[PDB]
């Protein structure tokens, strides 16, 4: 039982480091497989594009204090260190929306009170390091055992839905800059339709090859190899198709040139903790505790729920996962990186899920029946390290990257968002709403539960998800982790009162 | 078996006419059931669009006014009289692909010279009447039994391939008139909007077809929504195009009012007596072979449709018809060819949709296996209400002028793709590249070796390749002649190569 209170200081840390580290050479040996190369190529773009997007947003919202170069360097360094010393290497760490919101709010607060920003974040990093050390010393990470399936699925569904909304929203903003009138550049013709065509083509080739992977045509080995390289082949085909056209203008991937600060005239690579230009007030040094607590809560909840979803019993993970030597590493790396002005990072749920299920191997079942189960996952320490190094050295190259339009990557992002949905029981119970009761499958939560007492569960969980989305989209979105935490007392009290014991045991269980 | 000879010249016609007409009142009375109205709606929506789009291609290709209006009024005129004075009033008389391919070639041939024209077409049409009368009098309708599965599936596959290829030829011809350069022969957003529209309509129709037989919704609503796939896709795409403010897209070209030979004096009737130049003898007395080829096409299509619809499994009590339908179709087409208009045949897809939409289901508490005997709503009303409603849609040209021309091509692609299901040539062609251990449990895979089955499929593909090659290059007016000599091939060569057991499971009725 990984989530057990030993009763001794650093007990969980020692248990994790003795459970995972013996299987070290096995991780580097398991990487010899053509599937690993496809996983690397698939995840490189999915880890590079959000870095550029969020770097541009952060640079425009912070007066070019933190930009694209800093975010790329931070992601590379933190990913390399984590994949070299982490307990669970199937995690992809990167910048996200809540971190951006917190950074912009802190910048506004610092500007309002005439305080330094980069110097101010150093003390937040120090307090994060102290809090992480205190929590690991007291082995307080055993509280994850109280996060049931009722909360692991709302979080996953909400994150995967936002990933799809923000992908359809990037095409409306293209159609709004080049409208169909007829006659960085603006108002060009044939651009919006070309972007739509490229995105649709990439997405449809992705599903076509995914379907062909599990088909009956061709020999087995060729079929599996071709089905593994679905995303790279789709990307290559659509990039070549766009390269053939010579006159129409399409937006293309842009990266900065040279490892340098975005604003070298007002910033350096090293921040003095006590003062840059004017001395830093003493009171803020001890009043910075609250933002540290808030960002610690954000990082902790995100990383722990992602690890919980990844380490389910259905997904055959055998080497083991560490709930203690993950938070310590992530928070310590963030606190150290804050001293150099680089941003903080947390595990990305959709990227981690995609990375995990792009390495699974499915067994060969009989012709009739349901979907064949999962045989193995094939985890290792090589893919994440390679992806981090590639993202780090994505600056020296970039004359090659300038030929890849953004429209092509939208299809890959839509494919990722759609594929990441399957596997959670909330989605299947949402499917069961439409079907008539005589067509329901022979699953364990429908035979022992009345049909009308499962739709009530689904409706309550949808209500919780809608409330969460409404709270996130309003002006005060910094309370989102607290609202996410508040569902646990809901399940332990209100759902216990409304439902009976047997229904609660059947509907949401460990397995 | 109706396909027997009694020695009497008109013996088959007499036997067939004294089999349904005595039951005229029975066929004409019981038509008040509400189940027929839904079938009529389905037939109208499944038959209106192919007629209008085929007429559009005729008008844009022939350079003579045979566009939309001519074909619609032809279909209505043929259908009304067929329903009144014809036996087996379940056949739907529609324009098919092979007739397009043949008459395009004939018009190209007559334009290569300068003395054939529509008057030459009329001289073609007269020989149809003569030859049909001769064959019905001689009672040669029994030749249907000599055309087994080996030829029907080749014909169907070739027709589907031609149907598919013509859709991808207009896309290539729309990226050339309006290229994709920067800043109607060049309008900017015309080349890609058409592709978007046709892809959208094809995908919507395909998804509705897949959803029809799914596990969602009560099932009656599911079947109703799945029935309206093509109309719903067409409506959605035409609304989407109407929402766009300023972008050139080609629309339908139906003429308003009754129009024929606009830059010419004479009316609908065509005079085969020297309108412009004297017509020599050997372009009307030797103008008989294309009549033979058209007769072969019509005869094969109509008789195979009648065989398909009148099987023992599709139980039928009133009676069948094998001679009078052919006589009526060919003679009436030949007579009406001198009013312009295209020769018209009986298509099987619409007919079987009529048959299974007018058929009562099992109506049993036991799990469903196949539709039981129940009753069949044999009527002469659901054909008339379809033909008249199709033919009166010529004063509504204002609404049809807003339809984009790419949605129709999406519908062509959908029909050509969905018509490939049900012919054993297609499943054998699929099996040609599966591993041998994954082959299904059909009857023609256990009793014959894999190599012999693949040899049969490869031998059946060479005939298709030869027909495709001869259909295009220069002898496009002789492709119905190879579909005739493909019967002696199976008669002698296939028997000499294959054994008796293999050519009883591979080629089975």
Tell me the torsion sign for CA atoms A58, A63, A68, A72.
Answer: negative
Q: Do A189 and B192 touch (CB under 8 A)?
A: no
Could you tell me if B164 lies within 8 Å of chain A, comparing CB atoms?
no
- Is B29 exposed, middle or buried (CB count within 10 Å of its CB: 0-12, 13-18, 19+)? exposed
* CA A387/CA A390 separation, integer angstroms: 5
Residue A139: helix, strand or coil by DSSP?
Answer: coil
Considering only CB atoms, which chain A residues are within 8 Å of B193? Answer: 180, 193
Q: Which among A388, A373, A365 has a CA at the least distance from the CA of A78? A: A388
Token reading at A26: 């096995």
Whether residue A274 lies within 8 A of chain B, CB to CB, comes out as no
Interchain pair B187, A182: CB under 8 A: yes
Distance from chain centroid for Cα B102: 13
A220: nearest CA partner in chain B: B435
B361 Cβ neighbours under 8 A, 6+ residues apart: B368, B371, B374
Å between B154 CA and nearest CA of chain A: 24
Contact A193 B188 (CB under 8 A): no
| Pairing label, strands A374-376, A361-362 | antiparallel
* Burial of A112: CB neighbours in 10 Å, binned 0-12, 13-18, 19+: exposed
Going from N- to C-terminal start, the domains of chain A cover 11-423, 424-511
Q: How many helices (H) and strands (E) does chain B have?
A: 22, 2
Contact A216 B189 (CB under 8 A): no
Q: Which residues of A touch B219 (CB under 8 A)?
A: 436
Judged by CB atoms within 8 Å, which residues 319-378 of A form the interface with B? none
Which DSSP string do the residues of B434-502 spell out, in sequence order? Answer: S-GGG----HHHHSS-HHHHHHHHHHHHHHHHHHHHHHHSS-TTSHHHHHHHHHHHHHHHHHHHS-TTH
Name the DSSP letter for residue B370. S
State how far the Cα of B430 lies from the Cα of B439, in Å rounded to an integer: 10
Mutate to test the interface with B, among A175, A178, A182, A183 (most CBs of B within 10 A): A182
For residue B404, the cross-strand partners are B251
B434 touches chain A (CB under 8 A): yes
Q: Residue B377 has which token pair?
A: 């709503």
Resolution in A: 3.2
Instruction: Tell me the nearest-neighbour CA distance from B357 into chain A, angstroms.
Output: 25
- Name the DSSP letter for residue A272: -
- Count how many residues are written for chain A: 511
Residues of B in contact with A245 (CB under 8 A): 180
User: How far out from the chain centre does Cα B138 lie?
Assistant: 28
How far apart (Å, rounded) are the C-alpha atoms in residues B363 and B371? 8
- The CA distance from A429 to the nearest CA of chain B, in Å, is 13
Quote the tokens at residue A441: 């499958």
Bridge partners, A347 (sequence order): A93
* Geometric angle at alpha carbon A194, from A189 and A200, rounded to 5°: 155
Tell me the sheet residues that pair with A93: A347
Rounded CA separation A184/A194 (Å)? 16
Is the CB of A196 inside 8 Å of chain B's CB atoms?
yes
Report d(CA B423, CA B439) in Å as an integer.
17
DSSP per-residue codes, A326-352: THHHHHHHHHHHGGGTPPP-EE-HHHH
From B183, B192, B215, residue closest to A193, measured CB to CB: B192
Q: Cβ separation of B435 and A220 shorter than 8 Å? A: yes
Which are the residues after which chain A is interrupted (C to N > 2.5 Å)? 183
Tell me chain A's radius of gyration from C-alpha atoms. 24
Q: Which two tokens stand for residue A469?
A: 């989305």
Q: Which residues of A touch B434 (CB under 8 A)?
A: 216-217
Q: CB distance B182–A200 less than 8 Å?
A: no
């Amino acid at each position: 039982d990984p989530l057990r209170r030993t009763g001794r200081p650093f007990g969980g840390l020692i248990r994790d480091v003795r459970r995972r580290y013996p299987h070290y050479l096995s991780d580097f040996r398991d990487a010899l497989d053509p599937q690993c190369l496809a996983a690397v190529i698939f995840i490189y773009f999915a880890a590079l594009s959000p870095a550029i997007t969020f770097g541009g947003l952060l640079g425009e919202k912070t007066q070019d204090l933190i930009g694209v170069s800093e975010l790329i360097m931070s992601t590379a360094l933190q990913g390399v260190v984590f994949c070299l010393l982490g307990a669970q290497p199937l995690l992809v760490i990167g910048f996200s929306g809540p971190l951006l919101v917190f950074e912009e709010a802190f910048f506004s607060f610092c500007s309002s009170n005439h305080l330094e920003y980069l110097v101010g974040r150093v003390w937040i990093g120090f307090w994060l390091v102290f809090l992480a050390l205190l929590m690991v010393a007291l082995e307080g990470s055993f509280l994850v055992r109280f996060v049931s399936r009722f909360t692991q699925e709302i979080f996953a569904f909400l994150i995967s839905l936002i990933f799809i909304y923000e992908t359809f929203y990037k095409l409306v903003k293209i159609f709004q800059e080049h409208p169909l009138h007829g006659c960085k550049p603006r108002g060009q013709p044939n651009t919006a339709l070309l972007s739509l065509v490229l995105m649709a083509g990439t997405f449809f080739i992705a599903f076509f090859l995914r379907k062909f992977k599990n088909s009956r045509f061709f020999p087995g080995r060729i079929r599996r190899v071709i089905g593994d390289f679905g995303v790279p082949i789709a990307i290559l085909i659509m990039v070549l198709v766009d390269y053939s056209i010579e006159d129409t203008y399409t937006q293309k991937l842009s990266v900065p040139s040279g490892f340098s600060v975005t604003a070298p005239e007002k910033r350096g690579w090293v921040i003095n903790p006590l003062g840059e230009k004017s001395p830093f007030p003493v009171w803020m040094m001890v009043a910075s505790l609250l933002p540290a607590i808030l960002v610690f809560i954000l990082i902790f909840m995100e990383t722990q729920i992602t690890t919980l979803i990844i380490s389910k019993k259905e997904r055959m993970l055998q080497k083991g996962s560490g709930f203690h030597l993950d938070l310590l590493l992530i928070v310590a790396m963030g606190g150290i990186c804050a001293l150099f002005g680089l941003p903080w990072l947390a595990a990305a749920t959709v990227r981690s899920v995609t990375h995990a299920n792009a390495l699974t191997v499915m067994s060969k079942a009989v012709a009739p029946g349901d979907k064949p189960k999962i045989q193995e996952v094939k985890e290792q320490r090589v893919t994440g390290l390679l992806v981090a190094l590639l993202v780090g050295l994505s600056i020296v190259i970039g004359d090659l990257l300038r030929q890849i339009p953004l429209a092509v990557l939208f299809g890959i992002f839509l494919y990722m968002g759609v594929t990441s949905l399957n596997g959670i029981q909330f989605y299947e119970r949402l499917h069961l709403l439409l079907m008539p009761p005589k067509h329901h499958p022979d699953v364990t939560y429908v035979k022992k539960v009345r049909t009308l007492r499962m739709h009530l569960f689904t409706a309550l969980q949808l209500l919780c998800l809608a409330l969460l989305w409404a709270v996130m989209s309003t002006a005060a979105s910094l309370a989102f982790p607290f609202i996410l935490i508040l569902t646990v007392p809901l399940r332990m009290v209100v759902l216990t009162r409304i439902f009976t014991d047997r229904e609660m045991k059947c509907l949401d269980a460990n397995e």
